[PDB]
Amino acid sequence: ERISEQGLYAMRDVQVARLALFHGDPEKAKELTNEASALLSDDSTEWAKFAKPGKKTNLNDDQYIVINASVGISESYVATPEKEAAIKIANEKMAKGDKKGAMEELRLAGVGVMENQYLMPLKQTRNALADAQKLLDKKQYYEANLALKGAEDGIIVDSEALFV
Amino acid sequence: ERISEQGLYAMRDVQVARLALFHGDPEKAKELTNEASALLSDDSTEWAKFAKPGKKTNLNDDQYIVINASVGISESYVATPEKEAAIKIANEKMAKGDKKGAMEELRLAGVGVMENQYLMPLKQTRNALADAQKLLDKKQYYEANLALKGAEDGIIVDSEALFV
Amino acid sequence: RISEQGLYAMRDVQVARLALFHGDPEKAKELTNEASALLSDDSTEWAKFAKPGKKTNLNDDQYIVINASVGISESYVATPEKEAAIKIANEKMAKGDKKGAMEELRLAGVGVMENQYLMPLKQTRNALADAQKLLDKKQYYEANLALKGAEDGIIVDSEALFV
Amino acid sequence: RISEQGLYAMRDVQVARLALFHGDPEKAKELTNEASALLSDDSTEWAKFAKPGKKTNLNDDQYIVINASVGISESYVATPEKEAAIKIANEKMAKGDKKGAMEELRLAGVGVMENQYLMPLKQTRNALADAQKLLDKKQYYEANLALKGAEDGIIVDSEALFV
């Protein structure tokens, strides 16, 4: 994976924190927001290893960080002998680690394969968590929920044809 | 209003497994699929305790299991003295754990709050994972990816107004 | 049934938010007025499109069905039993026997959901009215947020089809 | 530039999938015929709506922009600086200086994305042709899956607006 596990866990923490605020548990929300902030602010983390260059951020000098990924499949689902043969060869090539050859066989049988990457703008997200922490410290719990929502709103999905 | 962390962990395994079939190790895909299947097949988990009762399933005698939850906020984002006064009171009741009274105060402020629950049909999902395990055993990797996709496709969202 | 007035109103909202940020507030104002008019028709039988039993944030509001889609879940494994079930289901669909067709698929391990998009009617009218006041005051960014609030009221409700 | 032709075609596909499972195959066939005709109509200047630099699965294909929406990210904390930037951005929107307006927001911590929905033209034409063959053979469940495959080719591409 080129997925940043720290960014993935941080955003999962934000989701649970926002729900905690509406279930009368600000203390859990505060602890989770602190965990998320610390996950994104480590000096040892090599964020460049997870960055998506070429995706321009709203903040200058910021970068989008890959924090999750999924596979997207498109096809007709019609079984033909030719498509079954292509899939058999694709499976063969994938077993041998020939990922690029496997994808070529799938694509000629009408299968589209995308990698969906979930992208987090690093400094923009840190700034939103910092705003949330200040509000939590002042017990402005609804407002903290909105700042956390703003962090979630910065996450985008980018889909790219795999091995094309 | 409790989430099955076991079901959520299983479905997260499924997502990683599908991508590994195209982009990582098929051996890791098999291991993740075995783990997801074992988590869902474990009846030491008290599944009924996490079920959503009034949601009819596709299989007879199945149940939807709550495996994730999030908050959805609707409002205009326009500040007024009346609204800020009501939000201040909402925050005070949140601090005292009065989650119902806090929600009544937010509705005075013009805020709509939903809880989104992600629902997993347990036996239907078990069946899809079992199909994927059979395919992976035969090195039918693309087909296994579709069986896992079918598992993901059974997850639905149900949204309900929080504490009305 | 699906409310095409609600469907068109929320489509107008989406286009209006884009128009504001492409430097066309006039187009956004026209579209927001159209959406307001679609949701305030005196002679729309809204109860015909309502989703009762879905509790709203506002007291005595109602959710309106404004869109729908089909969701299919299966494992894509071909067997003789499954192909035979699909053939029977297709024959039932050809005859208009929609309920039997879906039951035949479910018995073969195919899940068919109806995904309904639900609009809270009075809540959405209120959001549009807030956006109109901001547009009148030339508060265009703020109006874009108010329209976003109207969009965030739309929820999805999925039910097994003809179950 | 959004392709209204492509958007209409994909909306037809959604309704067709619903019609198949609500016992109306003739309506689904009519809707699928219309979607195929719209996408095959080369009097539409498809290249004018294409998203350059986005690689498709098929060798000589192109992604067509068929829909777009706005996404706003901010922390909702009112500060004198942000409130002044919103005032300036609103003035630039009113003058049609759309790029300066988004830059003003960006520099005050308000991020605006444009989300574009992208349709791979030849790939989508191919998926509809597959569905047509199935509909002609009365293979209605299979046609529903082939139409689902057409929808699954639509992707979202988000970019900072006028950055």
- Full set of structural domains in chain B with CATH: 1-66+121-154 (1.20.120.1940), 67-120+155-164 (6.10.250.2140)
- State the smallest CA–CA distance between residue D10 and chain C in angstroms: 12
Residue B19 parent element (H or E):
helix B5-23
- State the smallest CA–CA distance between residue D123 and chain A in angstroms: 8
Q: Which amino acid is at D5?
A: Q
- To test the contact with chain D by mutation, choose from C98, C115, C141 the residue with the greatest count of D C-beta atoms within 10 A, namely C141
Q: A140 vs A131, B88, C27, CA distance in Å? A: 11, 8, 37
The minimal CB distance from A124 to the residues D111, D142, D146 is found for D111
Q: Is beta strand A156-161 parallel, antiparallel or unpaired with respect to A112-121?
A: antiparallel
Q: Are D46 and D62 in contact (CB under 8 A)?
A: yes
Residue D116 parent element (H or E):
strand D111-120
Write the CB contacts of A79 (distance below 8 Å, at least 6 apart in sequence). Answer: C78
Chain pair C-D, CB pairs under 8 angstroms: 90
What is the C-alpha to C-alpha distance for residues D52 and C73, in angstroms, rounded to an integer? 34
What is the C-alpha to C-alpha distance for residues B65 and D13, in angstroms, rounded to an integer? 31
What is the C-alpha to C-alpha distance for residues C86 and D139, in angstroms, rounded to an integer? 9
- State the smallest CA–CA distance between residue B26 and chain C in angstroms: 19
Query: Which residue bears the tokens 């509001």?
Result: C61
Q: A80 vs B87, B136, C154, CA distance in Å? A: 61, 21, 41
**Which residue of chain B comes nearest to C128, CA vs CA?**
B76
Resolution in Å, one decimal place: 1.8
Question: Do C69 and D17 lie within an 8 Å CB cutoff?
Answer: yes
What is the C-alpha to C-alpha distance for residues D155 and A78, in angstroms, rounded to an integer? 22
What is the C-alpha to C-alpha distance for residues D48 and C83, in angstroms, rounded to an integer? 44
In 3D space, the residue among B149, B48, B4, A78 whose CA is nearest the CA of residue C111 turns out to be B149
Q: What would the two tokens of residue B59 be?
A: 């299989």
Residue D23 has phi, psi (to 5 degrees) of: 70, 30
Q: Where are the alpha helices (DSSP H) in B58-163?
A: 81-95, 99-108, 122-137, 141-153
Residues of B in contact with C149 (CB under 8 A): 74-77
C-contacting chains (≥3 CB pairs under 8 Å):
B, D
- Chain B interface includes A98 (CB < 8 A): no
Question: Do D94 and C22 lie within an 8 Å CB cutoff?
Answer: no
Residues of A in contact with B106 (CB under 8 A): 142
Residue-wise DSSP of chain A: ----HHHHHHHHHHHHHHHHHHTT-HHHHHHHHHHHHHHH--SS--GGGGB-TTS--SSTT--EEEEEEEEEEE------HHHHHHHHHHHHHHHTT-HHHHHHHHHHTT-EEEEEEEEEEHHHHHHHHHHHHHHHHTT-HHHHHHHHHHHHHT-EEEEEETT-
Q: C133 vs B59, C143, C146, D98, CA distance in Å? A: 50, 8, 10, 22
- To test the contact with chain A by mutation, choose from B13, B22, B155 the residue with the greatest count of A C-beta atoms within 10 A, namely B22
Tell me chain B's radius of gyration from C-alpha atoms: 20
Q: What would the two tokens of residue A128 be?
A: 């939103």
Query: Which residue bears the tokens 């002044």?
Result: D84
Q: Are A2 and A67 in contact (CB under 8 A)?
A: no
What is the C-alpha to C-alpha distance for residues C1 and C51, in angstroms, rounded to an integer? 10
Residue B12, exposed/middle/buried by CB under 10 A (0-12, 13-18, 19+)?
Answer: middle
What is the C-alpha to C-alpha distance for residues C93 and D144, in angstroms, rounded to an integer? 12
Which technique?
X-ray
- Chain A interface includes D47 (CB < 8 A): no
Residue A151 has phi, psi (to 5 degrees) of: -60, -45
- To test the contact with chain C by mutation, choose from B14, B18, B58 the residue with the greatest count of C C-beta atoms within 10 A, namely B58
Q: Are A1 and A69 in contact (CB under 8 A)?
A: yes
State the CB neighbour count (10 A cutoff) for residue A62: 18
- Chain D interface includes A143 (CB < 8 A): yes
Q: What would the two tokens of residue C146 be?
A: 């108010």
Give the CA count within 13 Å in the CB-facing half-sphere of B133: 14
**Which residue of chain C comes nearest to B133, CA vs CA?**
C75
